Design a protein around this ligand. Structure first.
Ligand SMILES: Nc1ncnc2c1ncn2[C@@H]1O[C@H](COP(=O)(O)OP(=O)(O)O)[C@@H](O)[C@H]1O
Lengths: 76, 33
């Protein structure tokens, strides 16, 4: 019996855990989403992204750099 | 007698929708601020 699916609860309010299928699915979805986002900017015919900041400054960036795209996103 | 007891795809990274809806977002945000 896992921590989450047990008659007694062992966690704080808001704390959870994902077991084999759920953890693997979450990891694969996140990684594949990141790769799909960063791709299409690859090779001589790759296109640029627009990074529209949601902060008070609302900075605007146009880039083809994968690292620049990946660092300026809020990923959970 | 009578007398008796009776008586999948979780990662979305929404792209342009926030840009389209920023008008209403700021409309509510000014009043909320
Ligand atoms: N003129 C070209 N002809 C063929 N392939 C190219 C050419 N220029 C770049 N590439 C290929 O594009 C790939 C990705 O480069 P790029 O799109 O600049 O992103 P990054 O270099 O950050 O991975 C490289 O592996 C390179 O082999």
């Amino acid at each position: 019996a896992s921590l989450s699916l047990a008659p007694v609860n062992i966690f704080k309010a808001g704390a959870d855990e994902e077991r084999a299928e759920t953890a693997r699915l979450t990891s694969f979805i996140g990684a594949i989403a990141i790769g799909d986002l960063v791709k299409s900017t690859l090779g001589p015919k790759g296109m640029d992204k627009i990074l529209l900041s949601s902060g008070r400054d609302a900075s605007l960036m146009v880039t083809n750099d994968g690292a620049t795209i990946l660092k300026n996103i809020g990923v959970d | 007698s009578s007398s008796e007891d009776e008586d999948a795809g979780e990662g979305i990274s929404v792209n342009t929708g926030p840009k389209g809806v920023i008008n209403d977002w700021r409309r509510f945000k000014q009043l909320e601020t």
